[PDB]
Design a protein around this ligand. Structure first.
Ligand code: HEM
Ligand code: HEM
Ligand SMILES: CNCc1cc(OCc2ccc3ccc(N)nc3c2)ccc1Cl
Ligand SMILES: CNCc1cc(OCc2ccc3ccc(N)nc3c2)ccc1Cl
Ligand SMILES: C[C@H](O)[C@H](O)[C@H]1CNc2nc(N)[nH]c(=O)c2N1
Ligand SMILES: C[C@H](O)[C@H](O)[C@H]1CNc2nc(N)[nH]c(=O)c2N1
Ligand SMILES: [Zn+2]
Lengths: 403, 404
């Protein structure tokens, strides 16, 4: 019933009891673990999810059973009974957004969960308005390199009406230009979105790091195209501390990781456009974004600059180049005074988070395969920590691409 | 479409479906409410069903499913359980079973090799001395002076009302772990308990960082007896670095042969409590886990200081740098000594090929992602980007409680 969770570096044993609060099914069954899969394969429903959330909210401020609690439950019940739905008070929304981050099993950065600026953009009626909110989000979150976590929340979904959607997966993304000679200039993860932009009338560039426009969509309307003011988008040229040739690669990355394709669910209400940003862990850029084969794929180029043996795997040329690239990202962001965390500091902070959550709730939902970094796994403490994975609401969820 | 798990490779974009998982009879630790996949250790009627199942598997493998000999073997096994409460496997059944157990092992990245496994039948063994002889032969055969060969030696099965054959050590080769009076550990901390068990049983202990442990061997209903391995049987590789000349002076070494000996081999409900097996190392096992784990030899800081790295800050990536050079030293020295080894890139590539083989051969392959992905350079290898389905097929290797 209650899972025995062991740390194999220290011998420590905990027991997760938070998992009992899980109301949603994951992809595993006793016959097969599907834990490594990236994506997933009436009115009393909503009402019970609403009651549960309001109950959480009032417990958070230590006022359970009180008359403000009991009254808020009836407001929620009266509205659902008459309209099939209801609305969150802003304070509740602020709470809900923090819990969704706190509950995100794949996020290594949750030590920060209580510090989150929440912009209420539920009074949005057009793509143009959505653009203003996004520009402001970016300005606030970027704060000249002293990054600050933020989320902007657009109107929730409503029955028989199209969704508010940001078509881009992140607020800032580099273009992917498919050359007709088989290759791709720019970021191959972004080929499809780049093509959507062009079809919607964007005039494309031809660099490896062309910042994409935002395609914003208000309900049942064609998406509209907005170019982000170049001064809003802070970027960091990459250079290496000892390899003077590194900067000559023209490599660079943007400061702000702002995810915009996820759906935020609070108390049974769904928010299809709710972009959020924190700051980068260095490996995201250094390992995944630049070294992944289906991305910028720079491993070989850097290895040759380093004059390593490329002819054989046993010279570990890949491992060596990757370390230097990650070092270039850390150095450069620190040089440009932009908030960034290395994977050792991050994982160490995540262990402290686990301990805080253990005392606070009796567990912490965590997805080992995502929490463990993409290089130097067992060299971080999270590797040796067993983790229980489950779904708590409020939550961030994936949703289909709107096209 | 298909009512089976869909499996994606995110590098290549390719999709497969796992139908093999339908063959699983034993439940794992996960439920719809929570995934426990990262957890390291989570009657004649029952026997007969497992026995019938394995006999069906065996006859399938030789393409005689539904045949007269198949049905006679079924009747033969049932009648044997009917009078003894257990049954016995034929030689070729044991060979097929042992190989299928390796094939079925979700955590093993080396399964491309699964059909080339030398199976030594040792079901005649009747003493601890004789266990020693068999073990020595295994080591000689498998070590083959550096040109390593996969092998398993299978000792008599669990019998009703008779003690188990057990090998107390977790591997046939392991370094002593000597607990110091100043709290620390000399040698391998992983092996503190078995070292103390060896001493309690009469072994005169050394005081090195790399003292090879004696074997504690247990024949049925008898106390374990102690056997020292003749040193020439135990191939070691001194560690040096291709370009960093000082690395040799660290005096580090590792043994050639990884030979796991505490696992239980299960076949058709028959349980072989002693069935040590061995292949060859993947370099990250030695270079990353055994030598760099904090709770193992923990040499990361030593090496980083020799490399003159800034160890006062995480963001210098000193751990990452030292780790790479240690791994490189493992590879270089094993190659120089001409002792079979595989780096984590070559291994993971070979595992992708294996997944493709098994997709065609069996409609899928049970695989534990957290264990298949290597402990350094994870996403630099192709398996990181490969979704995997994990489940228990039988025949299997299983963990078993320690004899004491
Ligand atoms: C403040 C610093 C933060 C750091 C260092 C951090 C770190 C990370 C990293 C490394 C990942 C893995 C992402 C990947 O490989 O694609 C991740 C995932 C995630 N993060 Fe954070 N994060 C931070 C802030 C936030 C904030 C403010 C939110 C939302 C309020 C958030 C929500 C999430 C979610 C929902 C995931 C999982 C995405 C998925 O399931 O695909 N994070 N985080
Ligand atoms: C031939 C070369 C082989 C290589 C390179 C190889 C590689 C590996 C590696 C790296 C692991 C991870 C273990 C750990 O980190 O603790 C592993 C696990 C495992 N291997 Fe293989 N292996 C090989 C041969 C074999 C053979 C011959 C057998 C048995 C007949 C076998 C059975 C297993 C089993 C049962 C595990 C899982 C152990 C556990 O679950 O705790 N392997 N292998
Ligand atoms: C799961 N496939 C990639 C994917 C990642 C997503 O999130 C990545 C993500 C999410 C939140 C983050 C927060 C901070 C940070 N530095 N990186 C972060 C990275 C969202 C949608 C998709 Cl489709
Ligand atoms: C659970 N981790 C410790 C443990 C590891 C075990 O096996 C590790 C193992 C098993 C087989 C291997 C075969 C080849 C190889 N290179 N390494 C191999 C490593 C068995 C039991 C235990 Cl208790
Ligand atoms: C197949 C595998 O589950 C997939 O590639 C995962 C593994 N772990 C990850 N971990 C993080 N942080 N981000 C990712 O995109 C992934 N991808
Ligand atoms: C807690 C976690 O499951 C544990 O550290 C695992 C992770 N993956 C592993 N992978 C391999 N190959 N060997 C191991 O011992 C482990 N340990
Ligand atoms: Zn699972």
């Amino acid at each position: 019933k209650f899972p025995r969770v062991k740390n194999w570096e220290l011998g420590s044993i905990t027991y997760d009891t938070l998992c009992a609060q899980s109301q949603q099914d994951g992809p595993c069954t006793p016959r097969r673990c599907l834990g490594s899969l990236v994506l997933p394969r009436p009115a009393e429903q909503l009402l019970s999810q609403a009651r549960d959330f309001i109950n959480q909210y009032y417990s958070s401020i230590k006022r359970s059973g009180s008359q403000a609690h009991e009254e808020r439950l009836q407001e929620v019940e009266a509205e659902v009974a008459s309209t099939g739905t209801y609305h969150l008070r802003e304070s509740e929304l602020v709470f809900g957004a923090k819990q969704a981050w706190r509950n995100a099993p794949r996020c290594v950065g949750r030590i920060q969960w209580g510090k989150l600026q929440v912009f209420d953009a539920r009074d949005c009626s057009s793509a143009q308005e959505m653009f203003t909110y996004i520009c402001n989000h970016i300005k606030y979150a970027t704060n000249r390199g002293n990054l600050r976590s933020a989320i902007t929340v657009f109107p929730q979904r409503a029955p028989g009406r199209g969704d508010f959607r940001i078509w881009n997966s992140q607020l800032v993304r580099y273009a992917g230009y498919r050359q007709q000679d088989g290759s791709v200039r720019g970021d191959p993860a972004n080929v499809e979105i780049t093509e959507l932009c062009i079809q919607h009338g964007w005039t494309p560039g031809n660099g490896r790091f062309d910042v994409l426009p935002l395609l914003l969509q208000a309900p049942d309307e064609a998406p509209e195209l907005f170019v982000l003011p170049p001064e809003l988008v802070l970027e960091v040229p990459l250079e290496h501390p000892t390899l003077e040739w590194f900067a000559a690669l023209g490599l660079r990355w943007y400061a702000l990781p702002a995810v915009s394709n996820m759906l935020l669910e609070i108390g049974g209400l769904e928010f299809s456009a709710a972009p959020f940003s924190g700051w980068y862990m260095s490996t995201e850029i250094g390992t995944r974004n630049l070294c992944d084969p289906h991305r910028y794929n720079i491993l070989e180029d850097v290895a040759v600059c380093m004059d390593l043996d490329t002819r054989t795997t046993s010279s570990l040329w890949k491992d060596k180049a990757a370390v230097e690239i990650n070092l270039a990202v850390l150095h450069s962001f620190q040089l440009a005074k932009v908030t960034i965390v290395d994977h050792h500091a991050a994982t160490v902070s995540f262990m402290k988070h686990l301990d805080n959550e253990q005392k606070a709730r009796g567990g912490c939902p965590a997805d080992w395969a995502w929490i463990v970094p993409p290089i130097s796994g067992s060299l971080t403490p999270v590797f040796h920590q067993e983790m229980v994975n489950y779904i708590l609401s409020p939550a961030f969820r994936y949703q289909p691409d709107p096209w």
